[PDB]
């Protein structure tokens, strides 16, 4: 039948894709970086601990100027901290306390949040009255909001649990582009430095690269064994790293269109919640469900250090634009700056 | 340094708001309504788009916050981890839909993030079950072969006017959930069975009394008494 012929035809395309991928695999990353010097034993200590959040933390985002950062907690509050002096700048109440993501605009004039309410709310921080009030409520998603990233002051890219990604234009409230193709719930998304493309991780153990302007999926990356919970583009924008529930992290190359190196350990059984890169991309920081954060040498896959300061699972982490410090969010209602 | 002084004053003002907001958060007992499909969970809220629904009610001057998930797909393995600190999870079961409800209770019971969260079990549609058993059109033996050798436990307190046939059937379904409950969760969480209807006004009282047991056990655990 026609349905059976398409499935039979689809296997030929997948086999051809595997044939093309195998031919390009002439030498893995292990032998290329085998002769390089080891990164050595690296150390970080908790410089500051941001306290004041009532409930567990789910998302955080560093500012462009690398001093003001926002944190989203499940108690229904958005707090903008001053990491240099630990003082709190803004405390934005939320209509829905079930938010799961937050973002900071590159200009710093707006912040966004979203979660189980399926609505992305943008708050104006530069109001003439001083108080922070909402500016635009984006509706149209049929699933829980998992991630959101800003392109500019009038554009934002959001991911939802309905296996679709959308691009929104502020001041109108209508989505301009919709990204479809995923079969599982989208958990995280990361924007390339060039902003022309972005990648997203879903629950189908696959990562898809999308063209923001065109709205079409360029490449699909497979290899993971479970749901992908985090993603982060390489600083050069030509690669990204993914964290999954299979206790393994993998690095995918856009040009190679295949996995380059996998980070795994026998003692690690728990999954990975958040993934971020350093300024140079040599180090890879990934959170774990065992209340610890592990730094991975991306070039050699050897463990470089362990961050053990959180009493609960690490749900979010990030590195500032200048790479001066890394802040990790955990379910223990405390945010710690590591440096 | 005047700006720094203003920053400290602004931070101090925020702390007062946080202190007042802290009292409200601990004054409300959050609950998750996780009734299965065609289980009558909508009728419970009604008798006391949008991806979530909120319903606030007060019982004996105790604030309660009940949350029903709508407009969210059938993949519950991702958004259920958010409800890992609620006071209790209200599980409504329509008494092979029953088999599906038992495999959703077992995976809630065994979840890593939900092993400390207690679950309130509501055996709904008791009136519907009473007439089905008497009619005899549907047989529980075909769907559950263990019903043949099952006997009514001695702790049962049947209501007046209840035939032994329906009493054995309703307790057999309840005991199936208890088998999963008494198989894991070594003192971290407990399951409370309840035979409830869709029109009874005692459901809010049952939840209030159930939350009393949960908080009492939690306080004893902190003191290493239980």
């Amino acid at each position, epitope marked *: 039948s026609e349905l059976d012929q398409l499935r039979q035809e689809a296997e030929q395309l997948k086999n051809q894709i595997r044939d093309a991928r195998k031919a390009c695999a002439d030498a893995t990353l292990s032998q290329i970086t085998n002769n390089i010097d080891p990164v050595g034993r690296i150390q970080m200590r908790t410089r500051r601990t941001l306290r004041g959040h009532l409930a567990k933390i789910y998302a955080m985002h560093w500012g462009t100027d690398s001093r003001l950062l926002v944190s989203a907690s499940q108690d229904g509050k958005l707090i903008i901290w001053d990491s240099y002096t630990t003082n709190k700048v803004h405390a934005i109440p939320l209509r829905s306390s079930w938010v799961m993501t937050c973002a900071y605009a590159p200009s710093g004039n707006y912040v966004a949040c979203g979660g189980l309410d399926n609505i992305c709310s943008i708050y104006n921080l530069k109001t003439r009255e001083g108080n922070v009030r909402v500016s635009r409520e984006l509706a149209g998603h049929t699933g829980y909001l998992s991630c959101c990233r800003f392109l500019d002051d009038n554009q934002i890219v959001t991911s939802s649990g309905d296996t679709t990604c959308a691009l929104w234009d502020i001041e109108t409230g209508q989505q301009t582009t919709t990204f479809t193709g995923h079969t599982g719930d989208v958990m995280s998304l990361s924007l390339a430095p060039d902003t022309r493309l972005f990648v997203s991780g879903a629950c189908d153990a696959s990562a898809k690269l999308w063209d923001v302007r065109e709205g079409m999926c360029r490449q699909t990356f497979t290899g993971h064994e479970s749901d992908i919970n985090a993603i982060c583009f390489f600083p050069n924008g030509n690669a990204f790293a993914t964290g999954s529930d*299979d206790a393994t992290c993998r690095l995918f190359d856009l040009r190679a269109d295949q996995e380059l190196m996998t980070y795994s350990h026998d003692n690690i*059984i728990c999954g990975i919640t958040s993934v971020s890169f350093s300024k140079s991309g040599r180090l890879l920081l990934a959170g774990y469900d065992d209340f610890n954060c592990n730094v991975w040498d991306a070039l050699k896959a050897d463990r470089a250090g362990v961050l053990a300061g959180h009493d609960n699972r690490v749900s979010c982490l990030g590195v500032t634009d200048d790479g001066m410090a890394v802040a990790t969010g955990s379910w223990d209602s405390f945010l710690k700056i590591w440096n | 340094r005047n700006e720094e002084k203003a920053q400290r004053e602004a931070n101090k003002k925020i702390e007062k708001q946080l202190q007042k907001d802290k009292q409200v958060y601990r004054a409300t007992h959050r609950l998750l309504l996780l009734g299965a499909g065609e289980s009558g969970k909508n009728t419970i809220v009604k008798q006391m788009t949008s991806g979530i629904f909120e319903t606030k009610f007060q019982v004996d001057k105790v604030n309660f916050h009940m949350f029903d998930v709508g407009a969210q797909r059938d993949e519950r393995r991702k958004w259920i981890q958010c409800f890992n600190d609620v006071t209790a999870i209200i599980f409504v079961v329509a008494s092979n839909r029953l*088999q599906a409800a038992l495999k959703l209770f077992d995976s809630i019971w*065994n979840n890593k993030w939900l092993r400390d969260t207690s679950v309130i079990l509501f055996l709904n549609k008791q009136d519907l079950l009473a007439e089905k058993v008497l009619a005899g059109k549907s047989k529980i033996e075909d769907y559950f*072969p263990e019903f043949a050798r099952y006997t009514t436990p001695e702790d049962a307190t049947p209501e007046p006017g209840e035939d032994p046939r329906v009493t054995r059937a309703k307790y057999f379904i309840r005991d199936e959930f208890l088998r999963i409950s008494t198989a894991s969760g070594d003192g971290r969480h407990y399951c409370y069975p309840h035979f409830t209807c869709s029109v009874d006004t005692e459901n809010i009282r049952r939840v209030f009394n159930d939350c009393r047991d949960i908080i009492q056990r939690m306080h004893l655990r902190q003191y290493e008494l239980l």
Partner: nanobody
Amino acid sequence: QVQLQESGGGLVQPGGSLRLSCAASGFTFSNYKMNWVRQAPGKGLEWVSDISQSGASISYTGSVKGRFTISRDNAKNTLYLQMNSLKPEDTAVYYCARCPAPFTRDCFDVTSTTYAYRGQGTQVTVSS
């Protein structure tokens, strides 16, 4: 790529026997719990049976408690389901479902309408 290819099934006379195999590839079959699901026409998915990682824990549904047998081969990365004493009511498309996460006692979204970790099952028809 998580791929699960099913085999077996077909037209069988009432009271016959059938054997379904579930080929596993792209993942470590030894540390994942496997489930059996079926979808007869005109109704949604239903759970059939499951097997633990080492096979110590075995459970079936009420209808096939005393008729079906579940077995797995960790070395060969295959899953078997021995069907005996068939009845015409058992006609359905059987899929082998993989647990969402490894080393996890719970297994969520097994019978969801859309499941990424589910293969294309084989139609089973029991009629005279």
